[PDB]
Design a protein around this ligand. Sequence first.
Ligand code: CA
Ligand code: CA
Ligand code: CA
Ligand code: CA
Ligand code: CA
Ligand code: CA
Lengths: 439, 440, 439
Amino acid sequence: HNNPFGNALIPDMIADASIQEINGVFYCYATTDGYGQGLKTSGPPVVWKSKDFVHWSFDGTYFPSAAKEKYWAPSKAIFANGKYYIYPTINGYMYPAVADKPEGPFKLARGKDEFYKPFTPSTLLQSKNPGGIDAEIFVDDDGQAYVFWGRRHVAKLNEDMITVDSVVQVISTPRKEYSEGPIFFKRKGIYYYLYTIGGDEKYQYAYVMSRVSPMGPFEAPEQDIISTTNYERGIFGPGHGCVFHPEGTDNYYFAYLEFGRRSTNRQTYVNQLKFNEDGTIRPVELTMDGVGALKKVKSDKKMKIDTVYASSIEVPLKIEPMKDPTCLRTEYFVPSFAVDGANGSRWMAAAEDSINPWIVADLGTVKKVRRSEIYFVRPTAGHAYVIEASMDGKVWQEFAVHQDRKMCSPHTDVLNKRFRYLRIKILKGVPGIWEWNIY
Amino acid sequence: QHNNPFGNALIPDMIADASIQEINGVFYCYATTDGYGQGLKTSGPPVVWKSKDFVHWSFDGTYFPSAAKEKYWAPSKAIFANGKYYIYPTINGYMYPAVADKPEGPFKLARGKDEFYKPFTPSTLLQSKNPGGIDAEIFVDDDGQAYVFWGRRHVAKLNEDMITVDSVVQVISTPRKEYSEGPIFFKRKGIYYYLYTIGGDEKYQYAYVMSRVSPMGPFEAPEQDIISTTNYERGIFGPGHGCVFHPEGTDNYYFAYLEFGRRSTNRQTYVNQLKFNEDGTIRPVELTMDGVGALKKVKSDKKMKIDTVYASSIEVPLKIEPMKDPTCLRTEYFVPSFAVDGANGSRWMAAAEDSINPWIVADLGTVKKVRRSEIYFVRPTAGHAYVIEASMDGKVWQEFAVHQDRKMCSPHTDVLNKRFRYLRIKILKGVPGIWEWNIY
Amino acid sequence: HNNPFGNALIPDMIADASIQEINGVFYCYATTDGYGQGLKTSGPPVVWKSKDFVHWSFDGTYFPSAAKEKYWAPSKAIFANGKYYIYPTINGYMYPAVADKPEGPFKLARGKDEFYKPFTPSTLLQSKNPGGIDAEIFVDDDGQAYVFWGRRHVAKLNEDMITVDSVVQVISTPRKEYSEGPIFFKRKGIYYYLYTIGGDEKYQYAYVMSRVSPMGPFEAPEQDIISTTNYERGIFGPGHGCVFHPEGTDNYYFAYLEFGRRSTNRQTYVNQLKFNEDGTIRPVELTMDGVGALKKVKSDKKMKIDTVYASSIEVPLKIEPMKDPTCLRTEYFVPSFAVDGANGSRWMAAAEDSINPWIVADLGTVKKVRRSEIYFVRPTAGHAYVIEASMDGKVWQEFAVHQDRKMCSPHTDVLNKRFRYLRIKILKGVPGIWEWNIY
Ligand SMILES: [Ca+2]
Ligand SMILES: [Ca+2]
Ligand SMILES: [Ca+2]
Ligand SMILES: [Ca+2]
Ligand SMILES: [Ca+2]
Ligand SMILES: [Ca+2]
């Protein structure tokens, strides 16, 4: 029954999210988590898209040359010079990348389109020491671009979108710890600089404000902490994310990663960000409920599932804390979590059930089904599966067999037939499902 | 005291057909501007009044440059879609779609060249051979489907571009059959509400029907279907074309309506609460001219107590002629104390013969520190030129400010920050009268 | 399921289309292709009509004097002096023609209504050398008419709609090579001049804009190419066509020919044309799907056809490229292409089967069919056929005989008889069918 991870924005483990609206579609560029080796690897660069902010999907990678590298904290995609630029941190270093559209294909914008370790001459910074992470771009009303990065750095960025200015400043803040994940935006003539403090469960965002310029001078309000652990709601370490508003509106949203399952097993959540009359930010009221649909659109209504059952259920995961001894959560893996409408809950088969684990949705009666959409666990590594239908629960007809490990989510099967039961057998990939919708 | 039969109107001007809404934490009022003296042959220009608290309102200029000297009626609410704001006013008798980046404009025609000529431009909202119709009202349903409602019970879907009306036009069925205009449409707790006017002048009423199916029906009429009507006892005549709104994030609904006023196009707009019974039926509105006070807590300055006022002249009382109700028999007075009473329904007016530096003087009890003055003139959209002066004794006048050019705004604000006992305004151009004069 | 020519607008090979709405009915005036001798001949002058933009028809010719001439690239029909004027290129030269209605009959608007080679004194241009092709007419808000033609030429046109101004200008564009197929329109005070460059698969439309007058001065934006080959979608050489918008709407559409089966074997397609806030045109997103119905009209539902078969099937056509070696397609001619709802696909009988070629529709069982509408291949050359009906497909009964060619499309036969099998035997005309609908 109990789900401590609520309704995450995306049915995957993602962190460091950059969310924006481009041509009336929402885009979410993020670090893909869940790859099982802490900070030593990541998932590949993928972009999730949504017309409504509720139904999200991705197909393949947007950055072919970077597809096998460790990939962190992409910026927003920035439209300039007829192109889109993005600034991820690849094998620990920042690079400029460019494409004709936000879906890619992106290529390195400086030097050759290849990677080797520790870094190449293609790095964003061209100083002798080119270190730094977590680029954030701002283009001001006068057309001047700026790049912000980790440890409170900022510099002007040239109109070519790849040459950082030689004058680098460090922004003064009243909170002093190691900082990463800068967020910057301008609203009604006030510039806002948001910066992380702490890590793991102690992750917080604080901010400062300027009416002068994106490089300061800045001022700190009394109430300078925007996100922090909320014990009563069970929301821990609300860190590296972004601020966005849909195009043309004054409706601001704060997206944040959460501690999750520890280490790189984070999910991302969104809440409203509100301002006082004096222009100060109201500390965010954090929840795991999301903000619902941000555009009114038509969608097919999903079928009620009467019951679900599975070949096996993984044993509950008791998540060990890192820095907060009171952060004590347990994740269950029951079949009903595949169909509960919450992106923070998942069914997982038992690790020993490694030969065609399966799950059945019973619709209760025979019904006309249009299609199935399956959001598998670790979707960026791909899944091969079989989908079968039955009239009685015993006799099964194969509707479709997918032997390839297609890197996408959701996996959609068009059915248009009457049946009562639907079964998924997983052939390859991680045997779990975040969400399974039948229409 | 002298009697003020027009109480406390929402706005310090003559406005009708109001569309009031909260957008990004601020209230906006788009309306027909009345008080131009030629009945329905002309109107004032397109202006939008704004307020942070629903009590203090202001405007500056027009929001629709191309239409600023056209006859401008009955704008819709400003509708957010496709990253933009759309508005659908009735310009020289005909509906047009207009678009802007913010609710302040500048708005432009959404189709065709941004310009007007009579009787209509190819830019009209309707595109049938006869594109006649007035009083547009827009609804966007939870699924994104947009609809346009207009006079005589018309409704059609609107495309995602928000400017193309669908070829399928329906006529809403209602139990009251007479000429109707000023549609209001909204959805609350799964119920669709279609409110429509009946009558005109003092006989203006709102009636309504409801649906639980769709914005195009089918509709059901309740027994108690008249929601606004003349209240003889309170002296409130012909509560017609207005709107319904609720502040964002609340279930507090309000009904705004025009009132017969001084006859013809000399109407003002009033606001009262709108309430529902548990079954979703609308409770007939309890009309007052008292208003609903502040709908948001904002910081503002307290006003100075004025001790006496007097002027160069006072216009003779107006004995208002009824139109359709021979019992609607009112008189408006024009005394100087009406400039500072805190009611938007009352005004000082100089006599017709006093057209050369008419003036009014406020007398604070003693010498005090005076931060600023805010003047709401009569017919504010035609612009005013004035001189403000201050004095210690009522005899010798230091000039604080001089505005030889008409500025089309309201209020006119002048920072002094001096000590003074008396203030005086001399009016150089514009209608020589004042709804409200606030001194802080 | 393999039709590389998609859903063409018209069930015929047409190019250089001029499309418009007059009094609530859509008109398509075009070059008729598919006559088998390259640019040496064309089909005759025909106007296709449609009330919904989906079901199209013509009957005979609209321009009797020109009916046997080489006929290219008619302009739109322009309403002026209480009449309709059109400006086609006939045996290689432009001529003004005039009619009382858009259906014709049209006749030459100057001099004698007759033709001889190389040109007559009735030509649009009245200089000693009246050469020039591809007329496009614009009438501005002030009532001034202009004629645009090939190689970037433009002049004022007098209110008589036949006398071209002596002052002829050549429009300055950044791309300098051979151009034809001009398209001109005004939208919100901005003038748009679109012109072709290249040819065959290398056909592209480029453009310039003016805020001053139909004759300039003109400015080119950076993104000045608005149609070009889309290899991934298989759309090659999107050239000579038109822009139109239905009466009273801000919905602009771009119609274009494409390379098709090489040489004069082209079809026409339509997509939405969209604009940016700054007035620039967004490069057209080319597809072969069409834009569906642009008007609501009542029409009868087509009956499902259970199976189709024929006397023969032409061997697949392996289309050789012209200028682009990557343009590599194959056309099939299977019987199901006759009934698939796609104007880009057709059944064709084998060449050898020239005596009694036939095609059967098998409706699943016996049913009362109201009527048959047949869109033959090369309809402008005319068809003669018989239509039979059967219960079992062994013994047949004739339900209509048409011994004479008629030059129209579709060929309708009203039937109202119950049967399972409908058979068409083609007596004269090209033995092939783009579409065959039963109601
Ligand atoms: Ca970031
Ligand atoms: Ca779930
Ligand atoms: Ca209205
Ligand atoms: Ca007053
Ligand atoms: Ca042409
Ligand atoms: Ca076909």
